[PDB]
Every structure is written in C-alpha cells, then in structure tokens.
C-alpha cells in the first residue's frame, strides 16, 4: 500500500494540522452552539403532525 | 453536531490543564499545602477560641 | 392505539427537550471556563522561577 | 508608605474579626464562616506583608 | 553554516548592544509597570462573566 | 578537484577572515546570551502539557 | 552577587530543612519526604555553586 497510502497520510496531516491550527476556541465554541438547534425544528414539526392526524 | 461539541470539550478541559501545570511545575505547590495542612485545624481552632471567648 | 401510540411520541419529546436543555447550560458553564483561561494563561508565567511572559 | 499599609491592614483585619465576632452571635453560621474565611486570608495576607516588612 | 549564521549574529550583536545602550534604568523602569497591568482587566471580567452564568 | 575546490576554500578564507574580523568580544559576548534561552520557553510547555494530559 | 546568591540558597536550604523537620511532626511522610527530596536537591545545588565560588 506504502507508495500511494502514505502519500494520503501526510498530506492529510499536513491539511488537518492546517485546519486544527486555524481554529480558535472562543469564536468556533460561539459557533459550535448555533448548529445543534437546527432539527430540533423538524422534531417540533413532525411532533405537531403526528398529533394532527391522530387528532 | 455532538461531535464538535464533546472535542471541544475535551478542547477546554485540556486548556485549563494545561494553564494549571505552570503552577506544580514552578516552585510553591509545596508551600501553599503546607499552609494548607497547618491552617486545617487553625480555622477550627479560631471557632473554638471565639465560643470559648463567650 | 393511535392514543398508546401518540403517548410514546409524546414522552420522546419531553426527554430530548430537556437533553439539550441541560445542554446548553454545560455549554455557558464551559464558556466561562474558557474565558477564565484566556485570563489565566495571558496572565500566568509571573513567580520568580520563571518569565516565560514579556 | 509599605509599613502604613501593613498597619492599615492590621487595623482592619482587626475590625474584620471583629465584625466576624459578631457575626458569631446575631449572624448566621455559614456567613460567619465566610467572615472567618476572609479573616484567615487578609491575615495570611498581612503575615506576607510583615515578612516583606522585614 | 558560519558564512550566514555568523552574519546573523553579529548583526544581531551590533543591533542588541545598540538597544540594551538607549535603555536608562529609571525611565524604563517607570514603563516596566504600566504594562504589568493590561490583562489584569480581561481576568476581572472573566471572573465576572462566569459569576454571572454561574448566576 | 583542485581547479574548483581551492576556488572554494580561498573566498571562503576571505569571506570568514572579514566575518570573524567584525567581531568585537564585548557586543557580541552580550549578544551570545540572549539567545540560549529560548528553546527553553518550548521546554516549559512541553513539561506544562504533559503534566497536563498525565493529570 | 554570585557569592550573595549562593547565601541566599544557603538560608533558604536552611528554611525548607526547617520546613522539612515542621512537616516531619505535624505533616504527611509523602509530602515531608518530597521536601526531603527538594531539600537535598537544593543542597547539591548550593555545594555545586559553592564549587564554583572557590
């Protein structure tokens, strides 16, 4: 496997060292909340149908 | 979603471990327990000292 | 059964409301936490031993 | 001016244990305890002062 | 690596000894404080912000 | 090798005799120190982060 | 100064064998063997620095 799948490894650790060193705590934790709350609409939606039909 | 969350966890957990190791590594760990354990029974015996006073 | 039924989804509902309820407020503690660390880790290397800050 | 603040700082840990003394009597437990926290802690603190003092 | 890492150093010497000479001990002294006291203000609102979720 | 290698080693000697004779003992003493202590900033850390993940 | 510093260890060796004798009766073994550890590494230090000062 060496020649091609250590090739992927290293330019992997290269990109997601990268990716790991552009990161700040503060402003991605801001940003690691916003997200979560996103199918929590659909949760509320297909709540209100199941209700609907079976009402 | 969960995923950021909980490495981010372990993300502030390392920082605040980290940021508390310059405390052992310089040199008065060993001084603050000792005022520690010789102030233990100081606080009981000020309570103590002060019912007495009564 | 659509009343059994509906109960369990309504039960279901009630569990991950309060999931991500208990979420968020670990989330704000961990915030702080962090905000501490800021100010201990821009404002530590200060004993004798050491002048790791400028 | 050192010396006058170690003094200043005698003087009012005096009146902090005084206030803790009296805490003790009409005062609740736990903010008495508190009262004898911060007794303990300006007084480590003057007992610094006096060594620097030196 | 002498005939560049010398040249570093030794500029690097003219221009240190050039700067450690224009430092007088008493007004740099006087500006060794003011700084001391910069991120003494972040850790006073930190503590307050986590006083206040804590809250 | 001659033709090139003696090339080489006489700019050289003048090249190094001009560096090592900019060289005052005294500047450059004061700027010998300056530099050893700074790999031992990285030293503190790693110390630091090991404390840390072993705790 | 180098011969004022090497004093200066000498008197805090001196200190922390006397902080090692006050935790030898009221403090723990671990930690007074520690300060049994610091005290002889602090003593080589100051016999090393003592070498030099000849």
Request: glycine share 4%; hydrophobic share 40%; net charge negative.
């Amino acid at each position: 496997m060496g020649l091609f799948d250590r090739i992927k490894r290293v330019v992997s650790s290269n990109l997601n060292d990268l990716v790991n060193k552009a990161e700040d705590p503060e402003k991605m934790l801001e940003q690691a909340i916003l997200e979560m709350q996103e199918d929590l609409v659909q949760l509320r939606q297909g709540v209100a149908q199941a209700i609907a039909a079976q009402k | 979603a969960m995923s950021a969350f909980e490495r981010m966890e372990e993300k502030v957990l390392m920082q605040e471990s980290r940021a508390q190791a310059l405390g052992e590594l310089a040199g008065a760990d060993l001084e603050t327990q000792f005022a520690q354990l010789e102030g233990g029974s100081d606080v009981d015996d000020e309570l103590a000292a002060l019912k007495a006073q009564m | 059964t659509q009343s059994t039924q509906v109960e369990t989804l309504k039960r279901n509902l009630i569990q991950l409301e309060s999931k991500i309820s208990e979420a968020k407020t670990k989330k704000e503690m961990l915030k702080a936490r962090i905000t501490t660390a800021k100010a201990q880790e821009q404002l530590q290397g200060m004993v004798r031993g050491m002048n790791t800050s400028s | 001016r050192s010396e006058k603040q170690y003094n200043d700082a005698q003087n009012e840990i005096n009146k902090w244990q005084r206030n803790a003394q009296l805490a003790l009597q009409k005062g609740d437990e736990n903010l008495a305890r508190q009262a004898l926290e911060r007794k303990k802690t300006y007084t480590d603190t003057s007992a610094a002062l006096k060594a620097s003092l030196d």
